[PDB]
Amino acid sequence: DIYKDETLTIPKGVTVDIKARNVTVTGPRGTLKQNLRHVDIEMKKQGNTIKFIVWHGSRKHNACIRSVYSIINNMIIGVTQGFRYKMRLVYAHFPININLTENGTVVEIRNFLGERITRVIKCLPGVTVSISDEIILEGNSLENVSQSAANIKQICNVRNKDIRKFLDGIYVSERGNI
Template sequence: MKDIYKQDELAIPEGVKVNIKSRQVTVEGPRGVLTKNLRHLAIEITVLENKIRFVVHHGLRKHVACIRTVRSLINNMIVGVTKGFQYKMRYVYAHFPIN
């Protein structure tokens, strides 16, 4: 069954600039610039003053589920340009003999 109209919003923090042109999302912040291509998804993405709005018209269940996915992707991009990500690599050795 199709949903007629679904929307979700994401707040943009201060110091972060979001530019969306034909579903090509660019996020600029103090730690750099990240770009993500979302042209394969049928979602209307608009930037308001300090919010990003995601809208799906006449979408099936999978299209409506993409709203939350896109919202999470852009939120992770915002976290990446403000706080940054740091991964620590651990070296683990385990020997399992065949016999």
């Protein structure tokens, strides 16, 4: 269509400036700088409302408008309240040992399924790890927190064994805000 628009109201967040389509959203919790060069959308800021508009876009290009609205709300939620993931360890026989170094940006996993190899993972920037067998992933970027959970889950994978019997692994339990 010629005009497809979505409207969002901005919260009390400090700066939402969009220089070079790059949203440098700074709020009470922190700063999240992300690019919107992947979408060709006129989003206009006036007063306390922002309008995402696409002109002459087809169905494929018009589908990304709601995705932009979803993500723009996402780091608004991140810079206001933040994102926290609670992730519980499941093991049958061998307890899983987890160590956090330099305030949790590196997580070391040992004794997974009885293996002697130490699995060390570097979390994405802006995410910190804490021990509540519960792991808490808190940060500003939902992108980085979810990715860090994905990396941990993929790293603690069972190989060449029957999943039907071996239910060991690490799966996310709760995804909420601080």
